[PDB]
Amino acid sequence: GPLGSMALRACGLIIFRRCLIPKVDNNAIEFLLLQASDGIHHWTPPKGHVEPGEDDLETALRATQEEAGIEAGQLTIIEGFKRELNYVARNKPKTVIYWLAEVKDYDVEIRLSHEHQAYRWLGLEEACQLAQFKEMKAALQEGHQFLCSIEAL
8 A cells, every 4th residue: 555655745935026016017026036056057946845744835935945045934925826846857756836925025035055056036037038947937927827816916
């Protein structure tokens, strides 16, 4: 009787800084992106792994501050939006659950772990260009699509 642990469980935080008012109707929202310190230097949000008796979101919260310095006490996790990117790159399927979050401070502290060396604040277009990965462009895309469906434009 297998426990069904097939695949690795993961939780990251799609952080988005909302602006007080619209500007060019595009850069109104920005996302937090960390740059890998090695590999092809792809851009990706605070990704981490969730423990067993650990919560799914708290893992994202813990990874958000550990790989960025921003924790739930520093951002606002949006409710109603939820999606996980699951795919097996090298040879292991990884489910990643992403929640939309907004950091309270525009210049909020950004701490990167050895895995990440640099981060950039860009709009969905660049966040999508850097996150060339279709899965992230959609996560960054659907997150923006849903947030525009709440109250703020």
